[PDB]
Ligand code: HEM
Ligand code: HEM
């Protein structure tokens with residue numbers, strides 16, 4: 001008599017946990033919860049339980065288990081239309097695990113040995129272009145260098161040299177496709193998603209061409225991830241990876257490595273040149289650069305980079321204080337116990353590298369910049385204290401690439417310019433999934449004789 | 450089979466205001482409209498979101514009142530922006546009175562006094578421009594609209610002495626409105642917090658001005674602040690306190706700034722697109738010639754009120770690109786619409802965007818045709834055009850917005866030849882108010898003979 005209900009279009013209940021990456025940086029809030037309730041606690045949002053694990057002990061059930069006990073599928077569902085069909089989190093475990101091993105081959109110690117001269121030259125040529133003096137937003141600059149370097153190392157000479165502007169524009173459109181809504185409704189047909197999908201298709205076409213040329217000229221042999229991906233084969237399967245899968249592995253490596261590396265490289269300098277940090281730590285860093293030039297010569301090689309321990313510790317301490325990924329997460333498949341507690345099937349568990357690395361019993365004076373704290377850590381064997389790169393079975397495969405990229409950046413900058421922080425240390429910017437220093441992150445450079 | 454860790458918080462927020470940050474799901478909603486008709490429901494986390502499309506279905510939305518349809522839940526995000534006991538943070542008794550105060554500040558009478566101030570600001574602003582150049586019209590109109598509002602809303606003292614400081618505080622409040630802020634307005638993240646501190650500082654700024662004006666009560670001030678200082682609640686001798694007065698000003702900045710500047714930007718971006726220019730510019734310029742013939746050169750209220758063809762150019766930008774994609778209400782009392790029933794607890798939506806592309810209302814709705822409004826304005830059926838809403842909570846600033854925007858374009862059209870650089874921009878859906886995506890470039894040349 002009153003009437004019937006209108007038609008219901010759909011009834012959606014998305015996974016809420018991925019939303020924490022777009023919550024505006026609730027570190028103080030979650031830290032207050034940790035100080036009051038201890039190292040394991042739960043928030044419920046829309047009835048979904050989100051269970052946080054803070055510090056090295058609580059880290060264990062998160063990093064020590066594997067794919068049978070903890071799932072990455074829901075947390076990374078956002079990435080499926082970004083990387084493409086049947087790539088990584090859009091692949092079944094059988095195929096995904098193989099793809100992760102192809103990626104591991106491309107980022108192996110051996111692969112890095114061949115990339116380092118390319119990374120070094122891309123850096124030297126980049127900073128050559130700079131005037132006798134000036135100012136720079138390093139977050140913007142390093143983002144430019146790091147996409148340049150990755151086009152060379154990952155995508156190969158043909159793209160880097162001919163099609164760089166084209167490929168950086170495509171990557172940029174993909175990236176602009178990842179919005180807060182995107183982690184709930186990855187297939188929502190909004191304009192930024194439509195533009196993401198077009199860009200992915202355009203990247204597959206660009207790589208089809210290169211792959212096809214290299215197939216038709218198989219004598220040649222090439223120094224890059226693309227080559228590794230063209231030579232990969234799944235167990236029991238005659239065929240190479242198709243064009244969509246190879247391109248998808250490349251987009252995955254850019255999403256994993258571009259903003260993470262550029263922001264950490266940005267914080268490393270922003271923190272080192274802040275006036276009081278600079279007085280205490282810049283002397284050791286410059287001195288080390290002098291001793292290394294003495295022992296290994298002036299050219300920058302893998303061997304010299306591997307001994308820049310003080311520089312290494314400046315990067316690492318930037319990462320400890322300002323980790324680019326505030327949360328990592330998993331859906332609980334098999335319940336577990338931690339101290340007197342049970343964590344049920346269906347919870348989403350979290351580790352915050354930001355929270356866990358401000359724990360005062362782990363890292364004394366957690367809020368002070370002290371790169372030399374790592375001298376003592378190097379003696380420690382307790383697992384999961386430093387977790388900026390994650391850990392265990394899905395720990396960062398790019399960690400050594402990132403350290404080489406960042407140390408190469410700051411070795412070339414330190415050798416060629418004298419540097420000062422304009423203004424106060426930036427604050428973090430919580431606008432995107434990857435957290436970086438707020439614009440402006442201005443530095444002053446003058447060339448040094 | 451065990452003990453659950455501490456649950457520190459369980460929350461089920463209102464999901465409806467999330468639509469404003471969903472990246473512009475116009476085609477999604479349009480497709481639903483086409484499949485299911487003029488009333489349909491989407492459920493998200495079990496919350497029913499019911500959409501009403503076109504003039505018949507708009508009737509329940511715009512004709513009902515506060516006992517039937519509530520603004521409270523939808524606008525709860527605004528309470529810590531505007532401050533305690535202001536607008537959507539006040540009870541109805543006081544809220545209705547505050548809207549009556551706002552209405553007094555925006556009446557024909559008050560606008561007569563504002564028009565010479567608006568005109569002076571625009572004329573001076575564009576008088577600073579070079580002989581020729583390019584400009585981002587969105588950035589430029591945003592700057593002029595905030596200057597102008599500082600003078601008309603806030604008074605000569607603030608405009609002439611404290612412009613920079615108030616604009617910064619306003620910018621900080623704007624930066625505190627994030628997607629997460631519409632679900633959790635009191636979440637203690639750094640942007641909320643900076644927001645809270647900026648609001649307090651604006652109250653301190655206004656306390657000084659209000660105290661000085663009260664100490665010199667014989668000085669006449671023409672601005673919204675004087676209207677709010679003279680306001681009284683029925684049965685209370687005491688004036689509005691300083692937080693309330695500041696709150697009303699902040700609400701008027703949030704209501705009026707981005708809406709007016711994006712609509713001002715689209716007005717020219719559309720009019721000067723090559724094809725639209727060929728067709729509609731000659732009549733617009735012809736009109737400006739006749740107005741100068743009849744009224745001379747002064748931009749008076751009366752002359753602006755005769756600019757019908759320009760008025761229609763604004764109205765048509767607004768029709769095609771409305772700055773608020775959705776308006777919404779929580780259903781307090783169930784209602785019938787034709788054969789349907791809408792239950793208590795639904796959130797009802799009207800999209801100005803979707804409704805003004807309804808082809809039986811607006812033929813060739815995708816085409817720019819300002820002169821459609823010669824026939825449309827003769828239509829008697831209610832709620833065909835809803836860019837400024839309608840009914841009880843319909844836009845109070847409409848006439849101010851049209852005065853501001855027509856003043857802008859009267860100054861620009863008389864002094865410059867203008868062209869669109871490149872393609873018409875696409876809408877940018879990254880903020881609650883939608884505008885043309887940057888770059889929004891116009892090339893200008895000063896007129897000569
Ligand atoms: C400072 C820079 C970087 C940081 C802070 C960082 C951080 C992380 C973190 C926290 C994870 C853990 C994800 C999880 O458990 O769910 C991870 C995984 C990964 N990272 Fe990075 N990363 C960085 C640079 C890079 C670079 C440069 C690359 C590639 C070129 C890369 C490739 C990967 C890959 C492939 C994984 C997945 C590992 C697996 O599932 O087996 N990362 N990274
Ligand atoms: C082109 C410019 C503008 C557009 C398109 C616009 C549109 C709208 C819309 C759609 C609403 C309805 C909100 C709802 O349904 O709940 C609204 C409300 C309002 N607008 Fe505007 N507006 C504009 C400019 C302004 C300006 C310049 C001011 C003030 C200076 C203003 C003040 C208001 C106020 C106070 C309300 C709330 C009215 C009430 O609750 O009674 N608007 N506007």
Ligand SMILES: [Cl-]
Nearest residue numbers: 185187188189
């Ligand atoms: Cl969807």
Ligand SMILES: [K+]
Nearest residue numbers: 060061336337
């Ligand atoms: K365990």
Ligand SMILES: [K+]
Nearest residue numbers: 578582583584
């Ligand atoms: K200019």
